[PDB]
XYZ file of N, CA and C in Angstrom:
183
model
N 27.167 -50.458 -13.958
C 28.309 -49.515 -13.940
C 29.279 -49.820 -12.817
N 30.474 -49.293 -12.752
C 31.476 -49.514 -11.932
C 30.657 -49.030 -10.293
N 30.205 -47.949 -10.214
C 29.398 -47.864 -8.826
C 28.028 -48.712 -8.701
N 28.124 -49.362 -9.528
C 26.522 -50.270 -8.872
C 25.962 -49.976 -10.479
N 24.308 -50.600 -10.757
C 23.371 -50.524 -11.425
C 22.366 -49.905 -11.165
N 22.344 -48.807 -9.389
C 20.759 -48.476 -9.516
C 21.383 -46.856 -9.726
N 20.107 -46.445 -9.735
C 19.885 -44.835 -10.549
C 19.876 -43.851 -8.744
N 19.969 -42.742 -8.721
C 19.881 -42.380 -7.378
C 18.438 -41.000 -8.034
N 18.690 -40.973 -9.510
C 17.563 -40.168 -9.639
C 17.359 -40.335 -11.091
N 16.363 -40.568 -11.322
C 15.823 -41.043 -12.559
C 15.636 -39.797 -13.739
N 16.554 -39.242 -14.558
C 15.963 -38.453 -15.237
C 15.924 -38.405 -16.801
N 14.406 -38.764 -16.554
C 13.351 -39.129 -17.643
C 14.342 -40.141 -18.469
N 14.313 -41.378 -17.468
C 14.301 -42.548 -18.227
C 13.556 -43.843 -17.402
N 13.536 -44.656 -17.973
C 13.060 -46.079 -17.604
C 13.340 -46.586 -15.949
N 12.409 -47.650 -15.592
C 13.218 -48.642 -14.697
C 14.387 -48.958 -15.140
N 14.829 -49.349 -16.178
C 15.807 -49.931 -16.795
C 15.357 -51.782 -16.712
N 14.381 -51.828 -16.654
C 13.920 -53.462 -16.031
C 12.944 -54.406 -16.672
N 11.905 -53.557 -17.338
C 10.355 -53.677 -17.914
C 10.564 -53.723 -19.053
N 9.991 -54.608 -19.803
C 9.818 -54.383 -21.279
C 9.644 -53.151 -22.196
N 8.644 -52.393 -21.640
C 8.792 -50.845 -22.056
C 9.650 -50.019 -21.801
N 10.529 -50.173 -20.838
C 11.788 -49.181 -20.703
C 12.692 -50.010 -21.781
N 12.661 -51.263 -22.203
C 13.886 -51.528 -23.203
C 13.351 -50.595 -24.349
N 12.401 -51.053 -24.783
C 11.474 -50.479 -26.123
C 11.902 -49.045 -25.898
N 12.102 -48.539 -27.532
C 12.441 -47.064 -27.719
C 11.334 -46.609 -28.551
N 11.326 -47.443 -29.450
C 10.032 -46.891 -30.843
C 9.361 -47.523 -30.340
N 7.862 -47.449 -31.367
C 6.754 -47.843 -31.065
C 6.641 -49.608 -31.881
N 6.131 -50.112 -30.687
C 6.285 -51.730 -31.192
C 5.857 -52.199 -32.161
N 4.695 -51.439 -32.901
C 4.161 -51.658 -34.204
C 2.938 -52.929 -33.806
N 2.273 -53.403 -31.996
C 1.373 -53.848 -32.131
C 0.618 -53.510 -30.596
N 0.296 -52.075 -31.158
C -1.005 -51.343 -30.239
C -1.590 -51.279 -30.958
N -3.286 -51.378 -30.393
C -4.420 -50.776 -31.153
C -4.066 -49.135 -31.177
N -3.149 -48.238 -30.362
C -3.144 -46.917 -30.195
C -1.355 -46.838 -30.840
N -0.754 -47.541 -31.003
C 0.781 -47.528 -31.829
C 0.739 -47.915 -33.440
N -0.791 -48.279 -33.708
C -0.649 -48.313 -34.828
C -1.278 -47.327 -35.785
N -1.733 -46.285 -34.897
C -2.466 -45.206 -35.031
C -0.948 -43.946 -34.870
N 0.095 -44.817 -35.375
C 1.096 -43.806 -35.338
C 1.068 -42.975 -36.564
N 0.837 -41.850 -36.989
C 0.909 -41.074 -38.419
C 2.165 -40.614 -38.074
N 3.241 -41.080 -39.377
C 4.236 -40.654 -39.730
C 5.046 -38.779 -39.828
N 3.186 -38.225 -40.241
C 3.325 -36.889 -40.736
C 2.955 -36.122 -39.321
N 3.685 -36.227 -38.427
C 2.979 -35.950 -37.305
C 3.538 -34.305 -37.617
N 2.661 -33.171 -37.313
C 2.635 -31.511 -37.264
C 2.704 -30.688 -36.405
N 2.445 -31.628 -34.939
C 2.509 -31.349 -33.292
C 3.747 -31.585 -32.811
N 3.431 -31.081 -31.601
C 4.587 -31.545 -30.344
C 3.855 -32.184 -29.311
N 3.270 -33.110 -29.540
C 2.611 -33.859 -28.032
C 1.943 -35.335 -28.564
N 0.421 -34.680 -28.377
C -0.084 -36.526 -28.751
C -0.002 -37.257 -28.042
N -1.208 -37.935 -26.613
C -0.587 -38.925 -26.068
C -0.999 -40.298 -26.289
N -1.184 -40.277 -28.092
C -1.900 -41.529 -28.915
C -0.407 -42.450 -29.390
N 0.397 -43.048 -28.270
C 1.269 -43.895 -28.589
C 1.686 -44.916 -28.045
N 2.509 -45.708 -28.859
C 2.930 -47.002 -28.099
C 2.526 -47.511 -26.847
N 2.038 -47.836 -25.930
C 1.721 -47.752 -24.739
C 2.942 -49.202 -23.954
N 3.327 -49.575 -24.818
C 4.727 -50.568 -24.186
C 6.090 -49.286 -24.143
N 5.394 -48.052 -23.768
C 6.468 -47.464 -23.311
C 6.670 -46.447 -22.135
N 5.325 -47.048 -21.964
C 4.677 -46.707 -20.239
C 5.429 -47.794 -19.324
N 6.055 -47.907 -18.903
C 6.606 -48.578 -17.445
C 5.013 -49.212 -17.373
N 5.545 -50.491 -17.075
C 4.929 -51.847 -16.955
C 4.718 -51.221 -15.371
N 5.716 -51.175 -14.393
C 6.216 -51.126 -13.119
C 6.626 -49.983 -12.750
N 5.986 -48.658 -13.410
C 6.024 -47.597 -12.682
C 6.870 -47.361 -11.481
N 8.258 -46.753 -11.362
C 9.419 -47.015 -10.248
C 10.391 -45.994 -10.650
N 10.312 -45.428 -11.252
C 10.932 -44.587 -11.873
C 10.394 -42.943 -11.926
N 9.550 -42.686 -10.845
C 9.607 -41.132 -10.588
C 10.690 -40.527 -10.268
N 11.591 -39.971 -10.867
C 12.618 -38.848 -11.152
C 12.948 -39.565 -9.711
């Protein structure tokens, strides 16, 4: 961006840096992302993608 590229507070997004912060959906090759059910009936579930966990954790708010 015109003031720079770093974040001064992260909210609820990525490093912007890691493979999992590019990734939005689920990559379609976890043993736990492919256990994605379409018909999902909840609001939670933490049976997903796991390339969308920060590789490099850096990004606490």
């Amino acid at each position: 961006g015109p003031l720079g590229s770093e974040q001064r507070m992260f909210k609820r997004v990525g490093c912007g840096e890691c493979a999992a912060c590019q990734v939005t959906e689920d990559c379609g090759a976890c043993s736990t992302c492919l256990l994605q059910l379409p018909h999902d009936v909840a609001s939670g579930l933490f049976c997903k993608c796991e390339r969308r966990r920060c590789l490099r954790i850096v990004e606490r708010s």
